[PDB]
Design a protein around this ligand. Sequence first.
Ligand SMILES: [Cl-]
Ligand SMILES: [Cl-]
Ligand SMILES: [Fe+3]
Ligand SMILES: [Fe+3]
Ligand SMILES: [Fe+3]
Ligand SMILES: [Fe+3]
Lengths: 174, 174
Amino acid sequence: MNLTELMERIPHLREILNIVREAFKDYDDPAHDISHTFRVMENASEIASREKCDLQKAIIAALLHDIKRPHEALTGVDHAESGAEYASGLLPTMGFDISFVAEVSKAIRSHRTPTSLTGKILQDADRLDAIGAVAIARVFSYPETFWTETARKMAEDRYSFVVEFVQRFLAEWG
Amino acid sequence: MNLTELMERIPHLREILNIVREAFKDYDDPAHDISHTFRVMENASEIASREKCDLQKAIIAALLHDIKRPHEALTGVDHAESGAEYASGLLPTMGFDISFVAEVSKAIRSHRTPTSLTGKILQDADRLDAIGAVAIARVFSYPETFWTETARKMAEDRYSFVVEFVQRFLAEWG
Ligand SMILES: [Cl-]
Ligand SMILES: [Cl-]
Ligand SMILES: [Fe+3]
Ligand SMILES: [Fe+3]
Ligand SMILES: [Fe+3]
Ligand SMILES: [Fe+3]
């Protein structure tokens, strides 16, 4: 799904994306910048769709999970705790119900085990970002551990691509 | 083949490698540094072996083909012309015969069409270095056009890997 499609399915998505962009304004650590959050949300979208789980919870949790990363860089306050508290304050103002907000907040709180489906999907989505083509590109610019079967398959696929990349690099280097 | 194996088959290889290293000492342009020459020689080794062509000529031509690149950077004198003249002077002193030296020299002279098997292999080996895993890594740190069937297959393989890399990058980026 593209963003237009996500915005058709997820309430307040545009405003949440906006808030996330604003939070990350001038936080450019390539290891933790905003593009990571967008890739995590793409991974969460794939996983939740294929697992037949709650997409709204998964997407929102992914968008918000590192929203307090810049704040941690300034203060040393743990971003998972801070991000969970932030989600609990923000989300009720957008009409999300108590159980929805509690699940999203707990997922963020647990992301660095998680106990909910949203938390498991979030953690998988986050950790998948350490592997693949973009991860390879980042290194140069500077699978059984996953909860869900969909993430495990994605991890296997990305890992096998990374292995091939290394093998080729070494074979070509001589 | 590893270098020990090449040194078992190719006269004066160690001394030639030594001379090449010395030529490149303090020439660090990542687009034209010594590691390119070594990758070209690896490509030439594969191609000449599989094509049942003269390995000695192919290897030596690959090692020497850009030996005057650093000199071109300083003077503007074309490295293909300069490299061919250099090979014609150096190689007879190592006991290579007139026809061998002329072929290697012409191959270097023509590498930027070539008319000999050595020149065709050299050009393929050189141009293959623009694609593949190491080429991808270089970009981030900063097939039917090939003469031989072996290079065409290698080019197809590397190009299909590059395409997959791009596709994955884009899919992951969101
Ligand atoms: Cl959780
Ligand atoms: Cl030629
Ligand atoms: Fe995090
Ligand atoms: Fe994260
Ligand atoms: Fe050249
Ligand atoms: Fe070259």
